[PDB]
Design a protein around this ligand. Structure first.
Ligand SMILES: COc1ccc(NC(=O)c2ccc(NC3=C(C)C(=O)CC3)c(Cl)c2)cc1
Length: 119
């Protein structure tokens, strides 16, 4: 497995904005507490899950645990930067998995809620 994505970086300027605070306290929190959140709460462990090809296919991994920690650490400059992480997480799931698989249907339901919350 690759190292998980960074959640802080001393060279990367930090920032707080109203939108980023909304992303943490409304958007992320509602997705995090949803029953379908669990496969998305930690970086994919391709070794433990016997998914040897996961990081062969997925070169920009992302998960809500990393997003949560980024938000809490003020890692992002702006909301768009965080939005991009969410979108990467969902697109990865759709690229890697079969349509029809539970995990895809779960991600689709989270993404629907996400889009409702950031409209
Ligand atoms: C304490 O016991 C346990 C604690 C945690 C787990 N976790 C899992 O089974 C698990 C299952 C699916 C996951 N996500 C995946 C995504 C987003 C993919 O696209 C493929 C798999 C993740 Cl990251 C973890 C098991 C036992």
């Amino acid at each position: 497995n690759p190292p998980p994505p960074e959640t802080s970086n001393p060279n990367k300027p930090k920032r707080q904005t109203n939108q980023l605070q909304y992303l943490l306290r409304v958007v992320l929190k509602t997705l995090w507490k949803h029953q379908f959140a669990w496969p998305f709460q930690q970086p994919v462990d391709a070794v433990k899950l016997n998914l040897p090809d996961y990081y062969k296919i997925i070169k920009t991994p992302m998960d809500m645990g990393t997003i949560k920690k980024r938000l809490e650490n003020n890692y992002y400059w702006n909301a768009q930067e965080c939005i991009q992480d969410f979108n990467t997480m969902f697109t990865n799931c759709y690229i890697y998995n079969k349509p029809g698989d539970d995990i895809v249907l779960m991600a689709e339901a989270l993404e629907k809620l996400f889009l409702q919350k950031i409209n």
